[PDB]
Each structure stands twice: as C-alpha cells, then as structure tokens.
C-alpha cells in the first residue's frame, strides 16, 4: 500500500492554458470546448429520448432514475416558489443536466492527454516526472482535444447571460412598472440601497459564470497537478471531491437561477 506510488511514469509538467482554438479548417472556427459541449448535448438528447421512447407506469431502469431526479428537482424548486416551479423548470433543468455532465467529462481519461497538435526519461531525485509527451515534436503544445466545457469562459458566459435574460424577462413579465420603484426610488435612504441592488443584479450573471468557470478549471488544474506529483494512489480523494463538487455546482447554478427569479418577481 505504501510502496507502490512510483513516479517513474508521469507527465513532465503541468500544462495550464485558456481555451485553445481548434484547427478550424472551414469557416466559423470552433474550439475544444465547443466539440465536447456538442457531444455532451448529444449524450443528453440520447438519454432524453431513451427515457422518452419507453414511458409507462412503474418506471424501472434509466426512466426510473430520470423521473426520480426530475421529481427531486421539482421538489427542490417548489421549496422556493411554487408559482413558477413549472414555467421556469425546463431552463434550470437543461442547465443543470448540461453542467453536471460537463463537469463529469473533465474526469474522463484523455482530457489534457490526447493532443490534436493543431522511468529513465523521468528526472531522477525529483518528486515530479519528466517524460516527454507524444506531440513534443515540432515544438508543439499537445493541444487537448477534450476539455471540460465549463472550464471555458464562453459556455459559462453564454449560460449566465441566457439565465439573466430569462430571469429579467420573467420578472418584467408580471411586475408592471415596479422594477424602477425598487431601484433608486428617491425615498429617504431607500434610493441608495436600491442602487446597490441594481448593481448586484447587473453583476450576478458575471459572478455566476466566473464562479462556475473557475471552479471547473481549478478542478482540472488540481487534477493535473496531483497527477504530476504522484501518478496513482494519490488523487483518489481529490477525484472524489471533484466528482462531488461538479454535480454540486451544477445543482447550485439552477438553484441560484430560480432564487434570483423569485427574488426579482418578489
């Protein structure tokens, strides 16, 4: 147990970079985040059609788990506000299901190991290995074809802005001219606190996007660093923490979206 943490075969360094533009031979260039986002959308749609093509009483199998999770989500959102528990359910459900599998994809082997490129080799007496990668030729960087979709500041930014637009539209849906009455109403000191409220409302989607992107990117970076430190028998607790926190943040995004919706409508 305490004699099998060999470091002779491991990554040479800890590669850290932002979203890397993929080759993009045709027009409208794509990146490594868009392809994985599309493949996760495909997986989600496949699971949806599998749970949909066979719908009946006494659910069992994939359909049972899907219905259980969906009813748990309805119960969780109903605990906040039952007025819009169904009118806004598809958005939060889709965002949650996409983010959960996006965070899960980062744990798949090959993420950061497969490169598209647009023992003795390891350094001795050092805790980190120095085995050169396959793409080390041409002075390349071994661009990761598979990357966590939420580890990119574009998918998170897009879901944040779509959530903000949905929340603002649903609030303006039934509120009359009441938004302005809550922002700088010029009634004593309520105007100043309304100004802070407006600023916070404006900065909420940016905060959400940055939080999710940073969380997932930091998870991937810490996994890479732990792999560099010791190839195996080190990162089991950290992998478990990452797999927990990915789904946790995925549910958090939807819950915060619903909470902001309720706090805007009320």
């Amino acid at each position: 147990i305490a004699s099998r943490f060999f470091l002779y075969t491991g990554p040479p360094h800890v590669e850290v970079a932002a979203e890397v533009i993929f080759d993009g031979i045709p027009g409208f260039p794509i990146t490594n985040s868009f392809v994985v986002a599309i493949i996760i959308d495909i997986f989600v749609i496949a699971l949806a059609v599998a749970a949909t093509r066979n719908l009946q009483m006494v659910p069992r199998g994939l359909q049972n788990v899907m219905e259980f999770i969906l009813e748990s989500l309805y119960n969780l959102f109903r605990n906040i506000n039952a007025k819009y528990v169904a009118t806004a359910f598809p958005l939060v459900a889709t965002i949650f299901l996409f983010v959960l599998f996006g965070n899960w994809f980062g744990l798949l082997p090959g993420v950061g190991s497969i490169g598209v490129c647009h023992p003795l080799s390891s350094v001795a007496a050092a805790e980190g290995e120095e085995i050169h990668d396959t793409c080390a030729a041409q002075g390349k960087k071994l661009v990761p074809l598979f990357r966590a979709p939420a580890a990119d500041l574009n998918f998170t930014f897009a879901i944040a802005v779509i959530s903000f637009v949905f929340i603002e539209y649903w609030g303006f849906r039934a509120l009359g001219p009441g938004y302005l009455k809550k922002f700088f109403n010029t009634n004593g000191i309520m105007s100043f606190v309304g100004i802070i409220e407006f600023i916070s409302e404006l900065v909420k989607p940016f905060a959400l996007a940055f939080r999710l992107f940073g969380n997932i990117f930091a998870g991937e970076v810490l996994l890479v660093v732990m792999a560099f430190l010791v190839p195996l028998l080190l990162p089991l607790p950290f992998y478990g923490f990452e797999v927990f926190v990915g789904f946790i943040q995925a549910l958090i995004f939807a819950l915060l979206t619903y909470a902001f919706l309720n706090i805007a409508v009320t």
Binding site: A18, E19, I21, F28, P29, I30, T31, S33, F34, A37, I38, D41, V44, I45, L47, A48, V49, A51, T52, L55, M57, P59, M66, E67, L70, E71, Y74, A86, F89, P90, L91, A93, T94, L97, F98, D152, L153, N154, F155, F157, A158, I159, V161, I162
Partner: protein, 42 residues
C-alpha cells in the same frame, strides 16, 4: 487570457438555446405528463 471569442460566444448561445428547446420538447413535457398522470390518477 480570457479567450472571449464573440463568434464562439454566439455559437455557444445558439447551442444552449437549441439544447433548451430540445429538452423542453423531449423528456421534460413527456416526463411531466407522466408524473401528472401518476399523481392526478394515483
């Protein structure tokens, strides 16, 4: 740095909208109807 690509940003927004529409059309409406049937006729 940020890697903020407006083209990729609009592409991601369109993909998210399409995913939301697909999810609303499949396994959301149907699962909701099934749950309502199992709850309103239990």
């Amino acid at each position: 740095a940020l890697g903020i690509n407006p083209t990729l940003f609009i592409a991601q927004l369109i993909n998210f909208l399409l995913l939301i529409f697909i999810l609303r059309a499949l396994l959301y409406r149907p699962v909701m109807n099934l749950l309502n049937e199992r709850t309103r006729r239990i």
